[PDB]
């Protein structure tokens, strides 16, 4: 029920800026500190920023100390991360996360403990590149009565990551295998999403992949038929 959701993300070239957002729903936002933590494709989890449950930015990672600024609004349940002077080292997936420590009663001033994050958001991908965003072409992977049939969609030549793929508008989930994207020599990602269905259904059921590539506002529906 307690959830955090990140927005923003996409390409931004080295040197310039983007602003990440995080909206929450399910808990009392006013009495929890918020973290920004990132994950680079080949690197471990890396904590980035921290703002108190009120107004205190108790921390930035030393490598972003003057570049990033973390903000908050307890009236709108919102936490932001302004990223300026971005570099390739900033390329990662960014999550906003709630600190496990609550608040309790005043007496003295507020206290600021930090028990170190319990609930995370889905994350948003930030790519720092001088390369141009490209929307994917979506091609069918069709089969050719008994056995188990396999269907698919080839999501080819797109940048940057990620893309999402659903089947029959979220109705078909069982038997779906969406593969991790592959970096072609062209510097463009390519991906396939398959699904194994009974062959008998090939003349009855309709099979459609839904490909979403947010950074280029791409949304394609593709009908896969034998």
């Amino acid at each position: 029920e307690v959830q955090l959701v990140e927005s923003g993300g996409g390409v931004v070239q080295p040197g310039r800026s983007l602003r990440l957002s995080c909206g929450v729903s399910g808990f009392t936002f006013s009495n929890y500190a918020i973290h920004w933590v990132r994950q680079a494709p080949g690197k471990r989890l890396e904590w980035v920023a921290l703002i108190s449950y009120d107004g205190k930015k108790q921390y930035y990672l030393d490598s972003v100390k003057g570049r990033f600024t973390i903000s908050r609004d307890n009236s709108k349940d919102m936490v932001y991360l302004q990223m300026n002077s971005l570099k390739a080292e900033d390329t990662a997936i960014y999550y906003c996360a709630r600190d496990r420590a609550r608040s309790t009663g005043y007496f003295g001033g507020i206290y600021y403990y930090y028990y170190g994050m319990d609930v995370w958001g889905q994350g948003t991908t930030v790519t720092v590149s001088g390369a141009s965003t490209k929307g994917p072409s979506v091609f069918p992977l069709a089969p050719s009565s008994g056995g188990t049939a396999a269907l698919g969609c080839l999501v080819k030549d797109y940048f940057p990551e990620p893309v999402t793929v659903s089947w029959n508008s979220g109705a078909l989930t069982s038997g779906v295998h969406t593969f991790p994207a592959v970096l072609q020599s062209s510097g463009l990602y390519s991906l396939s999403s398959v699904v194994t269905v009974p062959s008998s259904s090939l003349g009855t059921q309709t099979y459609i992949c839904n490909v979403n590539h947010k950074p280029s506002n791409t949304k394609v529906d593709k009908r896969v038929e034998p």
């Binding site: 989890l45 890396e46 921390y59 403990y113 994050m117 091609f139 398959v194």
Partner: protein
């Protein structure tokens, strides 16, 4: 400046086996250590806090132990639902350092893959390209060889592979191989084949199709 050293980096075990991952702090940190579970596809999840107390939802098979400079996460009966990467971290203070992580996977009974082959689409062929796709579905172990053949000529380097993370439903992997040629190079040849060697296979299985047939 405190460093967290996790070990091992990767780890594999059968279902119901005991599994131990350890975190090491460069200096005494008492009990300020959390464990996080990042399942394939999903964001990390808090499991253990204060080194030994598990979060409300986590199952009995998880336990935390140790103190000061040495900490241990233990799964007493490994389940495929526990597939993912595990992180330790020292909370309480900046910069909340994490360990490099431990990838955990399931040892399973050997499973032969279901192989499929897909010819390029007409739409793509109009663009001047051709992608032929070989699908290896639901197999174990992860080690599998895919060999593209174009008229029995062996291909190498002109293809790209991708393997799914271990599925928790059946502890299997899936693989997708893409062979990309120009439409011109493509329409010069007739038989396109993918040949698969795998431990669950008695002998290489080939899936092929004829261009235009």
């Amino acid at each position: 400046d405190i460093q967290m050293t996790q070990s091992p980096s990767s780890l594999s075990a059968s279902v119901g086996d005991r599994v131990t991952i350890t975190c090491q702090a460069s200096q005494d940190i008492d009990n300020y250590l959390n464990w996080y579970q990042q399942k394939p596809g999903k964001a990390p999840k808090l499991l253990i806090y204060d080194a030994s107390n598990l979060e409300t939802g986590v199952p009995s098979r998880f336990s935390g132990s140790g103190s000061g400079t040495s900490f241990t996460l233990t799964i007493s009966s490994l389940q495929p639902e526990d597939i993912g990467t595990y992180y330790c971290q020292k909370y309480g203070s900046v910069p909340f350092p994490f360990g490099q992580g431990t990838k955990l996977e399931i040892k399973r009974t050997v499973a032969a893959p279901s192989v499929f082959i897909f010819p390029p689409s007409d739409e793509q062929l109009k663009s001047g390209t051709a992608s032929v796709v070989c699908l290896l579905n639901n197999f174990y172990p992860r080690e599998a060889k895919v060999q593209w053949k174009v008229d029995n000529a062996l291909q190498s380097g002109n293809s790209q592979e991708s393997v799914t993370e271990q599925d928790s439903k059946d502890s299997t992997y899936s693989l997708s191989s893409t062979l990309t040629l120009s439409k011109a190079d493509y329409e010069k040849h007739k038989v396109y084949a993918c040949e698969v060697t795998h431990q669950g296979l008695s002998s290489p299985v080939t899936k092929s199709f004829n261009r235009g047939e």
